[PDB]
Amino acid sequence: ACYCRIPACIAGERRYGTCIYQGRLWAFCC
Amino acid sequence: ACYCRIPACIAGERRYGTCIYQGRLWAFCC
Amino acid sequence: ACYCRIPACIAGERRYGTCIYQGRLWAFCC
Amino acid sequence: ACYCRIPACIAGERRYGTCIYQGRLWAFCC
Ligand SMILES: [Cl-]
Ligand SMILES: [Cl-]
C-alpha cells in the first residue's frame, strides 16, 4: 500500500510524490 | 485509513486534501 | 499578477490554488 | 520574483516547488 508520511518514507519504501493534508506537506510513499 | 483517489472520494468519505504523484492530482479521502 | 502568499490572499485578490515552496503551503492568489 | 510555469523553468531560473491551480500542476520557478 501507499502512505502519506511525516517526516519521511520508511525503510522499504520509495517517495513517489507529496500529500497536502491538515495544513501540512507529507511524503507520498509506496 | 486515508486514500488517494481519482475521480472523487466515495460515499462515507470526505476530501481532506490532495495527493500529487506520477505527475497527477488525486483527492485525499478519509 | 498572481502571488504565492502566507498566511492568506489580500484584499482585491481571490485564492485560485496552492503553492508548495520552501517546505510550506502557500495560497495562490490573483 | 517567482513564477508558476508550464512546461518548465527558463534558463537562469531553478524549480523550487510546485503550483496547483485551475486543476493543473505548474513548476514554481525563481
Ligand atoms: Cl514539525
Ligand atoms: Cl507559522
UniProtKB/Swiss-Prot annotation, chains A, B, C, D:
It comes from the Eukaryota. Changing residue 26 to A: Almost complete loss of bactericidal activity. The modification ADP-ribosylarginine is found at residues 14, 24. The modification Phosphotyrosine is found at residue 21. Disulfide bonds join 2-30, 4-19, 9-29. This is Neutrophil defensin 1. It comes from Homo sapiens (Human). The lineage of its organism: Eukaryota, Metazoa, Chordata, Craniata, Vertebrata. The gene is DEFA1. The chain holds residues 65 to 94 of 94 of the full protein.
